Amino acid sequence: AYAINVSQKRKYRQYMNRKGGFNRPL
Amino acid sequence: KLVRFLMKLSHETVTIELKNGTQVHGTITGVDVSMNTHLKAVKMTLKNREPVQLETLSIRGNNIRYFILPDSLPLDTLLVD
């Protein structure tokens, strides 16, 4: 089947201006 | 199979160049596993002929030679299962 490929958008977890709690969310 | 990735490419403006030189560009709305491209408001330019705009078209996957997608096609997120 030769070679296929795909990449998931690496959405970095929000760190600043979260306006939420202390610990980073899931 | 790459037919499942083309089946999830609905409501996207792309082109398909056939084996006879006819290139039809439009918004693809439906695609089965046999690459039955049903598009709406497309424009097809044949080999050594004038382009013709149609409100609906149904291009077969057997006579389709190649495809052409723009730079706004998320191929990294649509080629996953």
Add this chain to the structure above:
Amino acid sequence: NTQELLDLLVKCENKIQTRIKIGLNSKMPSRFPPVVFYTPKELGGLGMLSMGHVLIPQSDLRWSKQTDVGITHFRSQLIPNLYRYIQPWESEFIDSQRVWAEYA
């Protein structure tokens, strides 16, 4: 011969090093390395030429090496003084006379 001159040179070098350390560290640095002072200008150091007996510490003369297959260590002592790197006046005069004769 002027041991007083050697002591004065050592004191002057110590004073200059203390001034440099004060300019760098606000407090008194406990035995700042001579590498900060005596390293040549090309390498980024102060390029100090001193006639003191500043022995290079063999304890902290070992370099590192970030090898691709792990961590590798490296091996390498007195900082030289100009007391001998410059020919003495009598030897310089004798050599100059001989060189003048040879050139003529």
Add this chain to the structure above:
Amino acid sequence: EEFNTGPLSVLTQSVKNNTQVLINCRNNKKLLGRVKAFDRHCNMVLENVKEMWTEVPKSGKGKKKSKPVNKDRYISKMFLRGDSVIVVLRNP
């Protein structure tokens, strides 16, 4: 298991590390590019495909005396099916 040892595995090697390969189809067109995805039916989806082919003026002077040129086009993202594809070869 057998997906990296077949003849298609050769096309897989051509795109093993997004390598550049040129595919010659049945319409005498050579599309060179990095294959992003493949399938069992040789449906190669690639990005930034340079299509080079032979073009002719088709008797521009009126006596059919002309030379073919290398016509070259660029595509952002293409999806060439394995039906019209004839051969493929990776770049050395």
Add this chain to the structure above:
Amino acid sequence: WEKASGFEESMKWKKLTNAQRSGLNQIPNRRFTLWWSPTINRANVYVGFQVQLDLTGIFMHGKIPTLKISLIQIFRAHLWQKIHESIVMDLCQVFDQELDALEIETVQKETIHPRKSYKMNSSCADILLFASYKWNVSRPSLLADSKDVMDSTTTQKYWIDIQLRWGDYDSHDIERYARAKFLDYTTDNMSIYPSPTGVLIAIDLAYNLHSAYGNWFPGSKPLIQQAMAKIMKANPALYVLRERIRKGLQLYSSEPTEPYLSSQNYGELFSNQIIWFVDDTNVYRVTIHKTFEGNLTTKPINGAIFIFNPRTGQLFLKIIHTSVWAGQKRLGQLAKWKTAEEVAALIRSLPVEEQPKQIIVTRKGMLDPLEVHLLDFPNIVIKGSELQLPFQACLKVEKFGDLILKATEPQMVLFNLYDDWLKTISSYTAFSRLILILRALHVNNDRAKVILKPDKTTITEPHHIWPTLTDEEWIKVEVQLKDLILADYGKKNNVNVASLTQSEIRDIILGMEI
């Protein structure tokens, strides 16, 4: 190293006050402190005054205001937490790229506080990836070890951690420090990792090193090693930090220069990248004519510059009036700078969509002024062309030369360098034909007369300049010109006329010193 060149001129070309001058003079002290900071920031150099930089791993054991300011500026815009998050995300992506083959069920990052990426007192687990199977917990050892020892311990959830450190001259032992950190985190009072078989990684940001001495999962130690190597090679946040550190220390490696176009790269300039073979050596022009008596006529001639694009068959000639080059009260370096500025301004006059992607300059020393004049437009690469093409033959043309002599005004009028090959022959073939024509013109006059117009009834097109010819006429003219060039080469070298290889002949025609 940029000696007193970190800023533009440290505001020296200005009229600032005395305080600004003192600050500028003390700025090199901060750079010197930063350069030797690891040897000075060691806790064994100063007294024990351990202070950790806010939201960063820099534990400055002491108070050095210059080095403190330099470190704070180096980590500007909250760099430490972002770098840690980027490293974690890169590791997770690298794992998930081929996690299925490595027996991984589900990979998700735990809920780690932002202050848990810089506080060494309390740690946590970075990656919480399931394995879908009883993953035999291997003995926690250094990744650098090649021993395959695994105690009788198995579990399902395997954890991975990453730590950031700025090692000093003595604290650069990444392997031992990482092993000690992992051991302390195994029995840590508050670093409650979920999996007791949770490996931990360390990054020696100060010394550009990375290590991990935790429980290497079966088959994951090579994966972790490859991921760490790839990251340390091209970690985005780490690369940005390294660039910032290089900028702060007034250090900048000599960037590679554009390569020269040898006989193998001669045809490489015909690609879609527009190349303008700039060669303005003949710009200088003067009478230098011996008058009958008393003196010699010191009358400068109206110069010009040469701009031609063999990649597109174009020819644009900008003429330099003798008045501009006479009586300006300057040396020749000012004239060269003015020529480079004029070339840059003519490039700017051309549209950005038509800007030449490469600028081949025949003059060796003209590349630096060309880059300086148009540094705001760096899309053009100043590539070297050692083999100088005979582009000066335009100045000897009946029309172009006469115009250049009398063009008292700066004219940007275009022209067609190829007689008819732009729409008739191949672009590379057009360039070869132009080179042959120019070589024939430079070889002699009568030979050039025979080559250009062999038949008195055959001449250039009224709207063209170069003599138009068909394939057969061009072939005959090129054969005659090649014979003349071979004769000239034999006369100059006192050797056999036709004794050069095809590549050697092409290099000789291009101007290589063979």
Add this chain to the structure above:
Amino acid sequence: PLNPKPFLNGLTGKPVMVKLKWGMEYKGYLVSVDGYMNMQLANTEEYIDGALSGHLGEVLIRCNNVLYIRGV
């Protein structure tokens, strides 16, 4: 008494020449063969109408595009 599938399996690595239906030929060492008899040549030369044009490296010919293959 020789089936073509062991003949194609035994010729993997041996210098052969696979001629396609379009008239071209790849002369080199065969790599493998699938169930659809796809051609994979390594260190091969591409000959159009018996005239070689140059080596290609790793060439792959599809199932319904090849015509024959002769062991050289």
Add this chain to the structure above:
Amino acid sequence: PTGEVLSLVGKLEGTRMGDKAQRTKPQMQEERRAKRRKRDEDRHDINKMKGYTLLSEGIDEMKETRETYEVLLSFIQAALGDQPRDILCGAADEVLAVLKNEKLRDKERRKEIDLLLGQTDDTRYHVLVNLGKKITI
């Protein structure tokens, strides 16, 4: 191991007076020697006729090819019977005109060279043919 520079009093008993003392060498001497060789080779013809005038000289009227010309003049004078410089120069010019402008004819130039030199041997004619082949507002 402090950073205090200790005094050299008592710590220089074995220290030499020329230790770490290096006598600098003249750099770029090869380029200067090449420039001197180019200046000596470019002024060879000016130094060869420096003292020779146009009115007060008797031998006035009379560089890879100069050695071949001297070898041809010596080969012409060896078969002439101690010819002077003008006769040797004329014989060398005649040999250069008969060996280069012979239109690649060796069967006819050999008899002329034997008549001009004295017909010593065929090896002298072969050496003359080899010298003629190696010679060429």
Add this chain to the structure above:
Amino acid sequence: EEPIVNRGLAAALLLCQNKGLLKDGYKPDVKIEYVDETGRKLTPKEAFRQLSHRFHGKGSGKMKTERRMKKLDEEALLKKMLGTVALLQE
């Protein structure tokens, strides 16, 4: 000087080369990168900018959006592809 030969892939490859267009036990086949959702491989400076935007949770402004759109349009136009007017005016 090699034209595109019909029914041949070696001529186009030669023209592209002349023009300059060219434990279980295993080796890791890992090659990760940071390519934007549009498919364009973000520059390391651009990748750092995207990471910092994600961390700060703030995106580009109106003027930044306009500049990015203009730059992208110009780059696309350049990637898509005055001699005749200069020949006719001469």
